[PDB]
């Protein structure tokens, strides 16, 4: 969220964080920017892609 | 490239003055020409001068300390609240240093490193109040904690000091470990450490739609660490022992300056800890427990410094009442109570160091003090009544407006417990007045007069305490400005 | 799973340090090395979290924690040395 | 001249340090064809992996 | 290094010379600045003298106090002069020369 | 100042040499660098 | 499998630390904890910190403890069926790839430099406190 | 990257085996305080060297600012070391 | 991938033989200084003497006291031998003649050098002898004290190079060797390595029966042999490091004539031989330091001076922008 | 008492180990000289007619 990367290029989840911060800078309520906030948080640790892939694996395995 | 340093400008001076004092006191305390002079009063006076000079440097540049704020943004952000907290912390440190001068001569404790370590702890506290991050806060906490561990066991051949120093060390390291675990486990779940970027991704969403276990648990761990630092029940495992064993000038400084900085840290954390379901109730419960335990534990205490330690714990509970409200008036009551408690603690420890000349240990030693030294007797009685919250004195205004803030949030259970604990504490406060105005024991103990430093500080504090409810407007206005500056 | 095997390991190390510091009033040595174990656990937390989400605010603080831990150990051993010269209690 | 007698063990250790150095070369070139490369950063290892893949597909 | 000097609270007075140089603010020391830079040094020297008579360090303590006071007084004079230059102080003496 | 300096140097040649070397190493980027950067 | 065995060995050593009777064996298992967690850091990607752990914890802190002790006595479920070559490598970041030291010293000494000086002050405080407590010069 | 440590680990294993068999073959046929102070001094200067390593490598990237920020750290710890010097912690 | 142990053995066995022959080399070149000949009856010119010593130590069944601890008293020589041997995995010989091409080679060497202190601490305590324990503790303190000087000199070298890779440092000396500009740093590094390995005027471990008797006073044939092998391997390693940093590792002297097209693997060897000759010369040239003045010397002559050299080199490079 | 010209020479000599390289070079002069030891089994030391040995 700070910008500095491990390999010295750029933060992996820095573009999403900066987009969320910029949009929330000029938004009165915080419930209009929860669309981007969830996106940034998911980009941090993949809270939905992993669920999707795990559900794919489970529904494939349940074919027995 | 040099004008950017006007923001951190006073801290540079205090660091450089500490280095100069260390160099002077190590060069001239070993020379055979001056046959190893004590060199403790000299370093103490020079350190008091340095603290006053950096206080002037900080106060005069009020419109300063804000330029190049973008450059310093990642490191520390000092708004109006930070300025007013630092200008008071420096005053308290200067008062303590001026207090602990006769202790360097009559006790014959000539170790100049004491003042140098006090100065370094003061710089750590200054770095702590403006620490607008999860890293600078921990670094400054450790910086003050190391100096405190070292100076708690400063007297080596004694037995209570070293044991208390070891226990303080263990408790502080354990607290720091918990706090650092909390900081790490909220960094890994949010990706951010700076307070601007931490009060933006969780302020609008705390448990409303869903919750994350990591961030809540880390917030709880941070709160546990902070409560350990301020010695709030039940996180007070060894604090009275630390107050007993530590040298009296140390515990005079150990119960005033650190609490101000830690409470500034808690206030700065509260601007992002917007959960309301993880921070307010824990501090509410801890405040109730601290008041109850302090009131029922200082009743049985027969020593003097143990009673002061438990009274400080009870006052910390009353202080936490005002933070539990979580409103502007709550924070205002918080700051007013902190200021009043700091002044009153300076008063009480000025008394204790005054009576330290003849090694006062128990509450009964100061018996029949109304005849030998009537003026000191009435001063100490006024201090005890100010602790009791007796109306016509300072120390009642703080508890008054604290209770008013508590009723502002509708926490009626807090008010009743506060009343009961106030009555109980008033009883054992006036118990001291009984021991030294009414009861006349067969054996009398005579106390030698004090020095001009303690006497002048005592007179100023005693006139402040009694005559405060006639002109309290400046404190109320400055505390409201400080509380209102916390958020905007 | 790879992040779980790191975080659980660090958390169990932290809990083990808590146990070591909270199972004996005597034996100051292990009660003080439990602090170092706790610092190791939190340092590993910082490093793993920094690598996992590609940010270099955990590595800087991880490196700075080294000095705090070393200074705490040094002061602890100083106090432990001076406590025998008065008491001599293990 | 006789001082070369003491220099004989030094010559032994020098030459056998030399063979210690050259052993990790004459056999690394043996089973990789090309010798070791000083460096091998992320770009280099990616290039080696891609070369392995393209030779495997070729 | 990328530096950006800018105050959140803008200067209330004229804002001439937004980023002055070190020798420039050193050369802008008015009579008041010299006076307040000298009084602090004098107080520090005399405090170092009076404090260091019991241990027996009659002069070196005075020298150390002089160093401390000199640094503090120069710091105060620089702070006042610079703050006057960036604008957020009552100047009435710099706009006259500018 | 020329009488105590030689006494100090005579007693501690190593400390004096280290001080001179460090002084040169700190003097080069404090004086030579600002004037060399302006050509 | 390399991670699990290393973590288990580290856990066993740590458990023996807080249970060993004589302090020397506890200190040696304490050393072993860092010895087997440095490898865990190393296989995670960070090589600088792996060596710093050896140099500091079992190079300076552990030898300090030894000197004192000698006297005074939602995971992704394993799916390799179609998740083994989907790794989209980007060659833009491979050219001029900084090691651990370069990308850390880029910003340790320049941007977050006050925390560096606060650490320096902490070290000075420790150095001062280590001599005002333990000294019997004669 | 980290693939250069596998030869080191295997070398360590082989060295352990050789050392073990070397001593397995023949079977077929009062308190001081200066030490603690010097150990702490070593710990402090070891931390100094640990901090020096990133500075020296990344020294061309940061010029005239990183150098002086490191010299300030060196000055602080040199003041500390000078204090150690006069307090009789270096000579015996 | 099965050929890695082949490389490891090709590193280990010649190095053990090198230690064995270095013992003979010193016992002969020190004897030649004192109007002697050394062992010249066993082999051709004693060339079979190290084999005789090794076989005699293989025989002569160990006494194995193991009074305090069976394990630690037996494990300490193993640990010190492993630490002595393991640092050779990163030393580069000519170009690709290096086992592991680490990017943190200097830090790895520093860690290995500082990690060998335990081998003379647990070994010292394991023997139930006050004269062994106290002497081993003091020797450990000396090595720990000179470790920081070693590290500071390494930082001085690293400033000019710009990378921690060992093979890159030698390639950085194409223009000139580092012994030319910063020669006093080379002298300090050599003296510190003398103190680090307990050799020449700092070797209090072989101070007979004075306050220091040695950590290996009561050891059987093979444990004493392992300690001896390990610390002579350390001697060879430090000579190699000293000639790799401040001298060209494999680069020719001045490559002006035409006969300097010979393989670079022997330039390293002859330079290491030169530094070993200096080691033995200094041993049989000067008397010993007492331990009290050794500590003061190592803390007040080599730490401030190495710090000043670090500061001066860094300032000079930054001032003129002569940075890598 | 010093004159700023002798302290320089003395400090330099104590800093460059001149008195140590003096002995270092001295010890090397016998390295290349002929040796003195005798091969005892073949050539033995000179005795005297008055030597007292086995009766
Ligand atoms: C200081 O006092 C001492 C001495 O006096 C100097 C000794 O000489 C010694 C003698 C020690 C030695 C001769 C060590 C020699 C040991 C050996 C040669 C056996 C181990 C060597 C190997 C296994 C490598 C052999 C394999 C090859 C050469 C492969 C060839 C390709 C000791 C132990 C001592 O303590
Ligand atoms: C410029 C370097 C900046 C960094 C310096 C860091 C230094 C930090 C620690 C400071 C230590 C200062 C030690 C210097 C004092 C050395 C002694 C000395 O110079 O004073 C003399 C003499 O000093 C004096 O007499 C007067 C002192 C000067 C006071 C004038 C005003 C203060 C100076 C202004 C500020 C100083 C600026 C220095 C240059 C920047 C001592 O005389 P006595 O010992 O008292 O006489 C003999 C006593 N007896 C008969 C018993 C044998
Ligand atoms: C704001 C004040 C700043 C100036 C304070 C100067 C520092 C004062 C240090 C005094 C502490 C001390 O050194 O003790 C001596 C006390 O020092 C003094 O007596 C006075 C010191 C100077 C204070 C007066 C200076 C006036 C200047 C103030 C600012 C104008 C010892 O007194 P004694 O042993 O002589 O006691 C016996 C006595 O004579 C019998 O009656
Ligand atoms: C709010 C309403 C009530 C407040 C009323 C305030 C009234 C205005 C203030 C009145 C002040 C009157 C002072 C009269 C002048 C006395 C001057 C004496 C100075 C002096 O003698 O020098 C030294 C005394 O230290 C000293 O005297 C200076 C040190 C004093 C320490 C004071 C520290 C102030 C900073 C912290 C204050 C607390 C702030 C808490 C928020 C040496 O003394 P000596 O010559 O006798 O010889 C040594 C004996 N030991």
Short mmCIF file of C-alpha atoms and ligand atoms in Angstrom, two decimals, chain B residues 20 23-24 28 33-34, chain E residues 41 45 58-60 62-64 66-67 70, ligand 2:
data_model
loop_
_atom_site.label_atom_id
_atom_site.label_comp_id
_atom_site.label_asym_id
_atom_site.label_seq_id
_atom_site.Cartn_x
_atom_site.Cartn_y
_atom_site.Cartn_z
CA UNK B 20 27.32 17.67 24.80
CA UNK B 23 30.80 14.36 26.64
CA UNK B 24 31.34 16.99 29.34
CA UNK B 28 35.48 15.92 33.58
CA UNK B 33 43.28 17.39 38.20
CA UNK B 34 39.80 17.82 39.70
CA UNK E 41 24.16 32.67 25.55
CA UNK E 45 27.29 30.92 30.48
CA UNK E 58 35.07 26.39 37.68
CA UNK E 59 35.76 27.15 34.02
CA UNK E 60 35.16 24.07 31.84
CA UNK E 62 31.19 27.50 31.95
CA UNK E 63 32.62 26.56 28.54
CA UNK E 64 30.19 23.65 28.18
CA UNK E 66 28.51 28.41 26.67
CA UNK E 67 28.47 25.82 23.90
CA UNK E 70 25.44 29.37 21.81
C1 LIG K 2 33.92 23.72 18.52
C2 LIG K 2 33.75 22.22 18.75
C3 LIG K 2 32.26 21.91 18.93
C4 LIG K 2 32.11 20.52 19.54
C5 LIG K 2 32.76 20.50 20.91
C6 LIG K 2 32.14 19.40 21.76
C7 LIG K 2 32.62 19.55 23.20
C8 LIG K 2 31.56 19.01 24.15
C9 LIG K 2 32.06 19.09 25.59
C10 LIG K 2 32.59 20.49 25.89
C11 LIG K 2 33.75 20.40 26.87
C12 LIG K 2 34.43 21.76 26.95
C13 LIG K 2 35.84 21.60 27.53
C14 LIG K 2 36.67 22.82 27.16
C15 LIG K 2 37.23 23.48 28.42
C16 LIG K 2 38.71 23.13 28.55
C17 LIG K 2 39.35 24.00 29.63
C18 LIG K 2 39.27 25.47 29.25
O1 LIG K 2 39.44 25.80 28.12
O2 LIG K 2 39.01 26.44 30.22
C19 LIG K 2 40.15 26.87 30.91
C20 LIG K 2 40.14 28.39 31.01
O3 LIG K 2 38.84 28.85 30.76
C21 LIG K 2 38.58 30.12 31.28
O4 LIG K 2 39.26 30.57 32.14
C22 LIG K 2 37.41 30.93 30.74
C23 LIG K 2 36.52 30.01 29.90
C24 LIG K 2 36.01 30.77 28.68
C25 LIG K 2 34.68 31.43 29.01
C26 LIG K 2 34.42 32.56 28.03
C27 LIG K 2 32.96 32.54 27.58
C28 LIG K 2 32.58 31.12 27.15
C29 LIG K 2 33.08 30.87 25.73
C30 LIG K 2 31.99 31.21 24.72
C31 LIG K 2 31.50 29.93 24.03
C32 LIG K 2 32.69 29.03 23.69
C33 LIG K 2 32.89 28.97 22.17
C34 LIG K 2 34.06 28.05 21.86
C35 LIG K 2 34.40 28.13 20.37
C36 LIG K 2 33.17 27.76 19.53
C37 LIG K 2 40.13 26.27 32.32
O5 LIG K 2 40.69 27.17 33.23
P1 LIG K 2 40.69 26.73 34.82
O6 LIG K 2 40.90 25.24 34.92
O7 LIG K 2 39.36 27.09 35.44
O8 LIG K 2 41.89 27.52 35.61
C38 LIG K 2 42.81 26.76 36.34
C39 LIG K 2 42.17 26.27 37.64
N1 LIG K 2 43.18 26.09 38.67
C40 LIG K 2 43.76 27.37 39.02
C41 LIG K 2 42.55 25.51 39.85
C42 LIG K 2 44.22 25.20 38.20
#
